Design a protein around this ligand. Structure first.
Ligand SMILES: N[C@@H](CCC(=O)N[C@@H](CS)C(=O)NCC(=O)O)C(=O)O
Ligand SMILES: N[C@@H](CCC(=O)N[C@@H](CS)C(=O)NCC(=O)O)C(=O)O
Lengths: 244, 244
């Protein structure tokens, strides 16, 4: 089986998967890949995943990418609790729906702050104020939608109990926070849903799942951060180039 | 049951779903919503889907959005052929993985041309060349990935037979084409994959699923296009504002 999971705990979709696996207690070989360094671009890694993206899971000689795909697969193969990924048609539909919306309106919008504050200047590139602002108004714009649409009255985005949907959302949301953005400030619903999940995941897990990222802003200050490889240097420029 | 599907055949995720339902022959009440007009923003529609996005399906009093979520749900509830959404763990994982990647690298990048050429100017807004270019190089950049990563040797992105993965990709791909972008030009693998799918879907269905969009560029020239409502006008501004 081997079952290895290549990931960097800085990447949020990496934490989401790492957390699910850990909490459900699934044997996994944690394969660290310094993203900031450019290891996911190493010839060796590309031999594992041509896309050079994290996280990617290798079960046997079957390599799979995409936290969602991974998360689901994992959940299935290991028959983890159903509340996680309900077999109920209506219930699972609600999960998928959020994941879809998540990829459209959450992923890629809530990761920008790290670029603006860390990765961006790491290679000398400074993000234009316009986008920096445009980004944040975009964020809360989406935080609200998330709040009264998915969260609404219920306790979770996908329904009545913690679900993959939550693990993704919060992990993705925690990034800006780790940079000093308190998106929960004036959103009791959010704060409460967050506090809820954190509650269900246990301080220990979360306390370690995060660690890396809440420290990063510092290694940034103190220049502990590694110099990106040219292959990562290029990927970085691309991503920054697409921040609207 | 009622089972109604609100959609505009201009939106690609709308076609994808409309096609699947049609091809699998699933009773559905086609509920047209002039996107360009701004009907998906009509107080009435919002009573149906707060997000004001298309397509959305209403089965009973259970309203669900997101083509993927929809597609899957539909496929399940109506026990349509398995090749579509394989129950095989490894096989379904491959689907999900593409859908994930699709939402990241396909959706939102291949729809831009219509904005640049149609919707943009429709409201007086002209898209900057930079982005117009940046966009296309981004497109083929992704078309390639798609080509040698998902399509690779095999006949389909998700595996050996047509799958939701394909229905999404091609429907999303067809847009730029409909505007005059032949993304299949120097990509036999693609063209061939396309030709294959088109083959499996039957000229009739596809000939009607498209119609609307291949004519649009003209109603644009001839000014047949409706004046967007201010609620659509604002939506449009936002989207255009996020074209990097
Ligand atoms: N949709 C994928 C996206 C993965 C992704 O983009 N990961 C980042 C780390 S935060 C990465 O590997 N970036 C480098 C690259 O893709 O070139 C998922 O959520 O699993
Ligand atoms: N991720 C969703 C996106 C749906 C979407 O953005 N649809 C467009 C039509 S092409 C729309 O409704 N735009 C108006 C808006 O969202 O304000 C899906 O693919 O189902």
């Amino acid at each position: 089986m081997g079952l290895e999971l290549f990931l960097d705990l800085v990447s949020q979709p990496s934490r989401a998967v790492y957390i699910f696996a850990k909490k459900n207690g699934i044997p996994l070989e944690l394969r660290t890949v310094d993203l900031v360094k450019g290891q996911h671009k190493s010839k060796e890694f590309l031999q594992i995943n041509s896309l050079g993206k994290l996280p990617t899971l290798k079960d046997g000689d079957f390599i799979l990418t995409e936290s969602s795909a991974i998360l689901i697969y994992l959940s299935c193969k290991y028959q983890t609790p159903d509340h996680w990924y309900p077999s109920d048609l209506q219930a699972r539909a609600r999960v998928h729906e959020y994941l879809g919306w998540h990829a459209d309106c959450i992923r890629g919008t809530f990761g920008i702050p790290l670029w603006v504050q860390v990765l961006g200047p790491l290679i000398g590139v400074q993000v234009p104020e316009e986008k920096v602002e445009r980004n944040r108004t975009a964020m809360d714009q989406a935080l609200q939608w998330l709040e009264d649409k998915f969260l609404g009255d219920r306790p979770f985005l996908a329904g009545q109990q913690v679900t993959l949907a939550d693990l993704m959302a919060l992990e993705e949301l925690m990034q800006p926070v780790a940079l000093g953005y308190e998106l929960f400030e004036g959103r009791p619903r959010l704060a409460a849903w967050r506090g809820r999940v954190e509650a269900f995941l246990g301080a220990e897990l979360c306390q370690e799942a995060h660690s890396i990222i809440l420290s990063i802003l510092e290694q940034a200050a103190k220049k502990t951060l590694p110099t990106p490889s040219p292959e990562a240097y290029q990927a970085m420029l691309l991503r920054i180039a697409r921040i609207p």
